[PDB]
Nucleic acid binder design. Structure first.
Lengths: 45, 56, 49, 305
DNA sequence: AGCAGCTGCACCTTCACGGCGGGCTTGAT
DNA sequence: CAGGTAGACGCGGACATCAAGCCCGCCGTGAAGGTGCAGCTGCT
C-alpha cells in the first residue's frame, strides 16, 4: 500500500506540503505526522 | 594477466612489480639549483630495497 | 664533579636517568612528532604521526 | 693472506641511529665497509699496545628497524627527517634528506697475532669490549647496557687448541650463541654465472642485477620464477675516476699527509644466510682488497665457496 | 676620495607519474 | 600395627528449503632556493 504511482505516500505528500504549500486531507496529514513520529533518514540528493 | 587466466590467450610479454621503493629528494622545491637532469626527474632517486629477513 | 672527571679524559661516565611526572588519571602524554614532508593524497592522509 | 688463530665474540650490541641510505641506488642495511673501518679503528686504538692484530668481521643483524612511512594512496615509501636549526635572520634551512635505522647486531672477529700468551686469555677480550663501547658503528652510537636483568659477556675462543671432536664442540657452542640471527655474504660468482646465462645474443650488464631483485610474477601459463634465498644488492667498494694526487695539492682535503683520489660506487650481490648451514666459522669474514695503482678499492668475503 | 665588505633583487624548470595480489629466509635445549 | 588377588566393557542409519542486504554530506595551512651583479655605506 501507498505506492508512488497513486500519489498518496509519505514523500509525495510531504513534498507537496512543505515546498508548494498545498496541504492534503486530514487523514494523510495524520499519516505524514505519524511518519515524522516514527523517525528515519528522509534526506534527498 | 587479469582477465585471461582461465583462457589460453596470453600475450608474449609481462610486467614487474618492484616492491618497497623509497623516494629521495635532493632539491626541495626548486630542483634546478642542483643540475639539469635533476629537473627532468624531480627528486625521486627511487632507491631499491636491500633489507635482512626477520627471524619469526 | 663526576661529570667533570669524565669530561677530562679520565673516565667515560655512564649515567642512568629516570624521571617521574605526576599528571592525572587518563590524561595526555606527548611523544615526539616526525617530520613527514609528503603526505600522499586527500581522503586517507594522516597529518600527525 | 691471513687465517685467524682465535676468535673474539662481542655480544649483542645495539645501535640507535645508523645510516639507512647506504648507496645512490640501495637503501636498508648499512654497508660492510663501515664494519671493516670499525674493526680497523679498534686495531688502531687497542691492537698496538697488546701486540694483537684484529682482522675480519662476521655480521649477524639479529634485528633491524627503519624509520620510514608510506604515503596515502602510494605504494612507495618516504623517510622521516630531523629539524635543523635556523640559518640566520629567522629563515628556515634547506632540508637535506637522510635516513636512520635501529640495529641489534653481534659480530665475531678473528685475531691471529702472536701476542696472545698463556696468562692473557680473558682480559684481552675484556679490554677489547671496554674500548668498543665508547664508539660508533655506522654513525649511530652503541647503546651501553645499563641496569637490566642479566648481562652478556664476551668470549675468546681458540681455534686450533683442542681435539677435532672438541673442535666441533667449540664450533657448536659458538654457533648456539648467535643462532636466531642471519649473516650477510657476498655472491659474485653467482652473479657472473647469471650474467653468462642471461646474455643470449643481447648485450646487458647491470639489468642483470635488477633482474635478481624484482618479483617476476609474469610468465606464459601465471607462473612466478623463484630465486635461491634472500638476494640483495650491496655497495661493494669504490672505483677510481681521477689519477692519484700528491698529498698537498687537493684544495680543502681532510688531511695534508695523504694522497687523494676521486672515486665512485660499485655494486655487487649478497645473500642473507643462517649461521648453522655453513659449518665453518673461520669463514664469513670480510677483508679489504686495494690494488692501489688502478683504483678498485673493494671488500669481500673470501674463501667462502 | 678609492678598494673591501655587506644587502637587496632578478634569473631559472617543470602537471602526481597505475593497483585485486606479486619473492626469498625461522634452531636446538 | 597388618589392608587381595583376575578377566572382559556391542552393533545400524539418517542431518531441510525460501527470500531479501540503506540513503546523505564533507577531508587544513604556515616553513623548508643557489648564484651572480649593482649599489650603498664605512674606512684608510
Amino acid at each position: 500500500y501507498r505506492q508512488p504511482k497513486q500519489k498518496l505516500d509519505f514523500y509525495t505528500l510531504l513534498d507537496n506540503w512543505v515546498l508548494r504549500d498545498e496541504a492534503p486531507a486530514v487523514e494523510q496529514q495524520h499519516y505524514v505526522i505519524a511518519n515524522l513520529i516514527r523517525g528515519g533518514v528522509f534526506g534527498e540528493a | 594477466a587479469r582477465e585471461a587466466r582461465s583462457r589460453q590467450e596470453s600475450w608474449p610479454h609481462g610486467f614487474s612489480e618492484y616492491p618497497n621503493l623509497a623516494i629521495q629528494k635532493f632539491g626541495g622545491t626548486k630542483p634546478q639549483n642542483i643540475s639539469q637532469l635533476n629537473s627532468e626527474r624531480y627528486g625521486e632517486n627511487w632507491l631499491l630495497p636491500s633489507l635482512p629477513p626477520h627471524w619469526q | 664533579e663526576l661529570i667533570a672527571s669524565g669530561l677530562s679524559g679520565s673516565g667515560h661516565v655512564l649515567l642512568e636517568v629516570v624521571a617521574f611526572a605526576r599528571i592525572g588519571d587518563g590524561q595526555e602524554v606527548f611523544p615526539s612528532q616526525e617530520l613527514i614532508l609528503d603526505k600522499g593524497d586527500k581522503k586517507g592522509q594522516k597529518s600527525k604521526t | 693472506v691471513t687465517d685467524p688463530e682465535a676468535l673474539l665474540l662481542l655480544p649483542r650490541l645495539s645501535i640507535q641511529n645508523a645510516n639507512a641510505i647506504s648507496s645512490p641506488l640501495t637503501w636498508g642495511f648499512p654497508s660492510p665497509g663501515a664494519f671493516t673501518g670499525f674493526v680497523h679503528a679498534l686495531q688502531r686504538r687497542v691492537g698496538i699496545s697488546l701486540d694483537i692484530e684484529l682482522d675480519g668481521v662476521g655480521i649477524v643483524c639479529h634485528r633491524f628497524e627503519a624509520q620510514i612511512s608510506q604515503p596515502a594512496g602510494k605504494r612507495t615509501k618516504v623517510f622521516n627527517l630531523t629539524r635543523n636549526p635556523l640559518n640566520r635572520d629567522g629563515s628556515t634551512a634547506a632540508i637535506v634528506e637522510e635516513g636512520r635505522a635501529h640495529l641489534e647486531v653481534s659480530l665475531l672477529l678473528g685475531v691471529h697475532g702472536d701476542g696472545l700468551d698463556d696468562h692473557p686469555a680473558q682480559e684481552i677480550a675484556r679490554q677489547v669490549q671496554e674500548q668498543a663501547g665508547a664508539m660508533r658503528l655506522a654513525g649511530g652510537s652503541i647503546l651501553p647496557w645499563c641496569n637490566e636483568r642479566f648481562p652478556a659477556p664476551n668470549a675468546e675462543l681458540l681455534m686450533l687448541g683442542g681435539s677435532d671432536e672438541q673442535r666441533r664442540k667449540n664450533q657448536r657452542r659458538l654457533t648456539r650463541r648467535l643462532l636466531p640471527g642471519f649473516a650477510l655474504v657476498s655472491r659474485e660468482a653467482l652473479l657472473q654465472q647469471h650474467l653468462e646465462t642471461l646474455r643470449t645474443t643481447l648485450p646487458e650488464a647491470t639489468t642483470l642485477d635488477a633482474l635478481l631483485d624484482l618479483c617476476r610474477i609474469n610468465f606464459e601459463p601465471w607462473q612466478v620464477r623463484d630465486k635461491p634465498g634472500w638476494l640483495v644488492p650491496i655497495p661493494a667498494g669504490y672505483n677510481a675516476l681521477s689519477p692519484l694526487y700528491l698529498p698537498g695539492e687537493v684544495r680543502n682535503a681532510r688531511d695534508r699527509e695523504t694522497p687523494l683520489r676521486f672515486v665512485e660506487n660499485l655494486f655487487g650481490l649478497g645473500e642473507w644466510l643462517s649461521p648453522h648451514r655453513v659449518a665453518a666459522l673461520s669463514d664469513l669474514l670480510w677483508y679489504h682488497h686495494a690494488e692501489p695503482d688502478k683504483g678498485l678499492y673493494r671488500w669481500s668475503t673470501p674463501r667462502f665457496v
